[PDB]
Amino acid sequence: APDENEALKRKIDAAKMPKEAKEKAEAELQKLKMMSPMSAEATVVRGYIDWMVQVPWNARSKVKKDLRQAQEILDTDHYGLERVKDRILEYLAVQSRVNKIKGPILCLVGPPGVGKTSLGQSIAKATGRKYVRMALGGVRDEAEIRGHRRTYIGSMPGKLIQKMAKVGVKNPLFLLDEIDKMSSDMRGDPASALLEVLDPEQNVAFSDHYLEVDYDLSDVMFVATSNSMNIPAPLLDRMEVIRLSGYTEDEKLNIAKRHLLPKQIERNALKKGELTVDDSAIIGIIRYYTREAGVRGLEREISKLCRKAVKQLLLDKSLKHIEINGDNLHDYLGVQRFDYGRADNENRVGQVTGLAWTEVGGDLLTIETACVPGKGKLTYTGSLGEVMQESIQAALTVVRARAEKLGINPDFYEKRDIHVHVPEGATPKDGPAAGIAMCTALVSCLTGNPVRADVAMTGEITLRGQVLPIGGLKEKLLAAHRGGIKTVLIPFENKRDLEEIPDNVIADLDIHPVKRIEEVLTLALQNEP
Amino acid sequence: APDENEALKRKIDAAKMPKEAKEKAEAELQKLKMMSPMSAEATVVRGYIDWMVQVPWNARSKVKKDLRQAQEILDTDHYGLERVKDRILEYLAVQSRVNKIKGPILCLVGPPGVGKTSLGQSIAKATGRKYVRMALGGVRDEAEIRGHRRTYIGSMPGKLIQKMAKVGVKNPLFLLDEIDKMSSDMRGDPASALLEVLDPEQNVAFSDHYLEVDYDLSDVMFVATSNSMNIPAPLLDRMEVIRLSGYTEDEKLNIAKRHLLPKQIERNALKKGELTVDDSAIIGIIRYYTREAGVRGLEREISKLCRKAVKQLLLDKSLKHIEINGDNLHDYLGVQRFDYGRADNENRVGQVTGLAWTEVGGDLLTIETACVPGKGKLTYTGSLGEVMQESIQAALTVVRARAEKLGINPDFYEKRDIHVHVPEGATPKDGPAAGIAMCTALVSCLTGNPVRADVAMTGEITLRGQVLPIGGLKEKLLAAHRGGIKTVLIPFENKRDLEEIPDNVIADLDIHPVKRIEEVLTLALQNEP
């Protein structure tokens, strides 16, 4: 009745609306023409009108059809990686026929600190669609994806509806960040709602608590990102998992010299000829200032360098240029915090270096064994399961069978207790891939032979002394390369897998395929036995 | 009183309703004609009215009466299998007289990756009834099958009521997927509700929390599917179990060339003359790229091939056709991940190959035995029970009785400890069917005779050296065929069961019925003893 109800009514006629939009517009019209000073009644309908005007329809982004430009765009996002972009291109080709996905959503998984956001932005630019993000981590209620009931003012729509209202296109690139961090603790499981907004048979008629009228969401492209492969079962359908990994020394150096350095220089309001960093400084930072698979440490170190350089040049008008090399780098970072190289490790007896497979990239572990006098009981530490128990039992049996050859007293399992400690045993690794490590440590404790340093080993063991194949050799090799380990012992059955590993990692490490316990004991111990 | 209460009232008169529907309509009418702006009061009654209008009655699907068309439809679902479809036809014949089931629900069980959904859709098409699915896995509360109490808005009906409202027919095909995955952890056991909706004496008057008025559900046909035979006892009544199994090489090849390839080609938006795959590529994929009973691996590999072919042909306008054979297949899949054939296995002593019966299809296991110096204690690994203990004891007794004939020192059980390892001993197999395997491995450890490779064995043993019959020979034979094993040793009493196995599996394997331990020791060991 008042003037407000008139102006709002115009917002319904000044915007073109399809059948569903016309239906919700008619509903709002029936809800309009009422008293404007009505507390919590006119404001909610006004907000609904604004949302409808903001909801996209009869308009979309010009989606590109050529694939060459998509490849050229994907080649300049972070580094290219020559591995994941190819898969992306494949998906684009499958989508180069119709506007209907009818399949996966190109899910990305890997350790944090990689080009996930960069890949999403590159895909948005290649597809010619607007970019929009939404975080799935920490979500535990359907009230986060969907809105509230059609009631008094304050019942704002869900995050998805808000993002769609802000992005006035019917075919945007909706990114789903931290899908593995989503939980279900407030109102059932919100995964169902996600399915309703992701399944091509349900997104066309997706209904919201506030926007009860069905909205067409089949043209919206969705992309999910995660850190681990522990994606909920209902969210695993219609999804393709693409695993990402770390980078090598030269790869990280090129990445830093291509985007990290220019971005940090432009962010700190620096000039083109104010700071010059060579490759020696970056190498020193990667070797003694960061230990990870991503480039987060490099970014933080470059930011600190830029800030310190700006402060030093500002307080000294006589300084015209600042150059940081591999020698004065410490002057801006301090004492080194990490060690590179195992040449001066002073090889020990009870300690063994092994490779561990982790969902965020493999790492290095130092397993220990203690053989003290007792009655023969077995003790283990590191939150190990039954698999580790049977593996230790098999290793003990192998040691008992080869004690005569190794010079071990056959009565060691009767008058001496064994305690095996495996640090970070709760790693997301299904299977006791450290069998050879524990066996070598046991042989060392019983014989006193120090385990040769700068040597890494991983793989399963049997009761007859045979080595079984394992998975995730790329991550373990990358971890050994970052840790400065040159000698790596892997099972023989995994030799055929080396053909799928780039030469940049194999040319730096010395791999020796083994299949028996005697070979690992000969190549790992300092002496012959 | 307002205009809304009027329109809603019309929805009660514009739809024909039986006695029960008229009763719930009268209840809603008594609940209607109230204030429409009543928060959580008018919306719930409006939803109830919509549900009632959507609930089916006085309308049904034209159920077919002929059986020839049903057989023709069942012959084109996945492959036909010539085994389960027959049983289905039998059920249809029993149902070709009246619309009352009064019996089982045609429960299907088998390993994942088979034509379960295809069988359900084929049954729906043959019976002329609409198809609808509902997943039973993960259900742990009665609030999932039934609705909520008749209270404020938000108390939506159960999944069953929603499916019935969406499918406007009184006789639909309700599929119950993952019945073995259902649990009872939130509100008692929902199985009771299932019975109320499945028992012909209770479905006619099935009451819901939201739809408190009894609804006739006797004309609704129910079908359940599962993976294992561990169906809850209350849900086992009025149910017929139909077990499914894997497929052979030629069967999988025909299935891939009949539906997998066309479906994957149509899904990837491919043309009729864009990709051509021969039988060599499919054979190579089944032999070195997948090890299962279903066709999931084949589907994934064909999808990857189609995606790679689309990307390769799109980025190369000069390419007119892509042909993948048994040689260039690796170019699209990489290095082989599985091994086929045991000819180059390099027969070992302490290892023995055996067949294992599993609820999702039999598989191959490698049992090991270690004879180390000690006092004669017995150790076992693989989460074995008392049955395995008594079986190992019987095998040890047989070895002690035949040590003189086999050349074993009679004092082996007094100065040497034995450790038997059975990988994946927790298999759902009731009975130590690996007696001969453990006995042969023990004889090998004590004598050093390597067990001939490419040989499989399974069966029970006694104290006198007699072999007892076992069950599940089809699954074990299929596993041996997939693993590339030609020599299979089975008990003599099971010979009469070979007549129930198709020739496609027997013509590829060399079965030798045995009844004594001497025959298995002669046909399994490399030498005579």
Tab-separated table of C-alpha atoms in Angstrom, chain A residues 30 41 65-68 71 86-87 89-98 101-104 106 149 151 187 202 212 240 390 393-394 397 400-401 404 413-414 462-464 466 468 493 496-497 499-500 515, chain B residues 37 39-40 46 152-154 267-269 271 274 304 306-308 310-311 313-317 333-339 348-351 368-375 379 381-382 417 419-421 445:
chain	number	residue	atom	x	y	z
A	30	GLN	CA	1.356	-11.743	-3.317
A	41	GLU	CA	7.678	-8.293	7.194
A	65	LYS	CA	35.157	-23.617	-27.341
A	66	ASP	CA	38.783	-23.761	-28.522
A	67	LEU	CA	41.266	-25.924	-26.633
A	68	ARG	CA	44.555	-24.364	-27.780
A	71	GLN	CA	46.280	-25.035	-22.935
A	86	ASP	CA	46.830	-32.676	-19.315
A	87	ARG	CA	43.985	-34.294	-17.378
A	89	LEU	CA	42.556	-30.558	-20.943
A	90	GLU	CA	40.990	-34.000	-21.319
A	91	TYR	CA	38.018	-32.899	-19.233
A	92	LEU	CA	37.725	-29.701	-21.264
A	93	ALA	CA	37.673	-31.767	-24.451
A	94	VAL	CA	34.862	-33.894	-23.031
A	95	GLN	CA	33.069	-30.620	-22.241
A	96	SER	CA	33.834	-29.137	-25.683
A	97	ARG	CA	30.619	-30.604	-27.149
A	98	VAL	CA	27.667	-29.640	-24.912
A	101	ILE	CA	28.783	-32.009	-17.574
A	102	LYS	CA	27.090	-35.366	-16.861
A	103	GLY	CA	30.106	-36.727	-15.016
A	104	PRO	CA	32.926	-35.839	-12.614
A	106	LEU	CA	37.548	-32.438	-11.484
A	149	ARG	CA	12.960	-20.714	6.369
A	151	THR	CA	10.121	-16.098	7.948
A	187	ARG	CA	21.888	-30.738	11.467
A	202	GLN	CA	18.751	-32.516	-8.912
A	212	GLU	CA	11.709	-22.437	-1.997
A	240	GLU	CA	37.369	-37.542	-10.548
A	390	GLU	CA	52.630	-59.322	12.605
A	393	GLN	CA	56.835	-61.077	14.384
A	394	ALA	CA	57.869	-62.001	10.837
A	397	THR	CA	61.308	-65.073	12.831
A	400	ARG	CA	65.914	-66.243	14.413
A	401	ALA	CA	66.359	-68.223	11.192
A	404	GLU	CA	73.670	-68.409	12.751
A	413	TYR	CA	64.541	-64.225	21.972
A	414	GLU	CA	64.490	-66.082	25.319
A	462	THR	CA	57.720	-62.054	4.555
A	463	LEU	CA	58.689	-65.009	6.735
A	464	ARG	CA	61.069	-66.386	4.078
A	466	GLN	CA	61.233	-61.936	0.497
A	468	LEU	CA	56.948	-57.351	-1.369
A	493	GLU	CA	58.708	-55.664	-7.985
A	496	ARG	CA	58.663	-51.346	-13.349
A	497	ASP	CA	57.170	-48.294	-11.616
A	499	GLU	CA	59.412	-45.708	-15.665
A	500	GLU	CA	56.555	-43.474	-14.446
A	515	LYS	CA	64.130	-58.667	-3.392
B	37	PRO	CA	0.380	-16.109	8.798
B	39	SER	CA	4.349	-19.434	11.727
B	40	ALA	CA	5.104	-23.171	11.437
B	46	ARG	CA	0.189	-26.920	3.150
B	152	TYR	CA	5.712	-27.564	13.148
B	153	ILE	CA	6.989	-27.141	9.567
B	154	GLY	CA	10.125	-29.124	8.735
B	267	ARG	CA	28.723	-40.411	-22.558
B	268	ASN	CA	31.970	-38.851	-23.834
B	269	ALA	CA	30.065	-37.240	-26.752
B	271	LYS	CA	30.810	-40.187	-32.893
B	274	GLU	CA	35.800	-41.678	-34.024
B	304	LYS	CA	40.025	-43.031	-19.627
B	306	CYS	CA	37.657	-42.245	-24.508
B	307	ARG	CA	38.749	-39.080	-22.686
B	308	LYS	CA	42.341	-39.379	-23.912
B	310	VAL	CA	38.884	-37.026	-27.417
B	311	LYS	CA	41.682	-34.785	-26.146
B	313	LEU	CA	41.767	-35.811	-31.649
B	314	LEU	CA	40.678	-32.308	-30.599
B	315	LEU	CA	44.238	-30.946	-30.391
B	316	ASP	CA	45.082	-32.510	-33.798
B	317	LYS	CA	42.745	-31.499	-36.628
B	333	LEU	CA	47.211	-46.461	-19.803
B	334	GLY	CA	50.927	-46.591	-18.966
B	335	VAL	CA	52.881	-49.476	-17.495
B	336	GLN	CA	51.023	-52.657	-16.583
B	337	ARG	CA	49.999	-52.922	-12.930
B	338	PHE	CA	49.087	-56.629	-12.695
B	339	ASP	CA	50.751	-59.925	-13.713
B	348	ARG	CA	59.438	-71.454	-3.894
B	349	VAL	CA	59.589	-73.830	-0.935
B	350	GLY	CA	58.000	-72.033	2.027
B	351	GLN	CA	55.189	-70.538	-0.089
B	368	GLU	CA	53.834	-69.355	4.245
B	369	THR	CA	55.502	-71.575	6.835
B	370	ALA	CA	58.775	-71.157	8.713
B	371	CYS	CA	60.588	-73.990	10.505
B	372	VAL	CA	63.221	-72.396	12.750
B	373	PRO	CA	65.287	-73.988	15.556
B	374	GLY	CA	63.593	-73.951	18.940
B	375	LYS	CA	61.645	-76.087	21.413
B	379	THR	CA	52.867	-69.861	16.219
B	381	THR	CA	49.644	-65.210	12.093
B	382	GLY	CA	46.703	-63.910	10.095
B	417	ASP	CA	59.461	-74.133	16.232
B	419	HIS	CA	55.318	-70.445	12.407
B	420	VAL	CA	52.422	-70.532	9.926
B	421	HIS	CA	51.296	-67.290	8.259
B	445	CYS	CA	59.930	-76.466	5.001
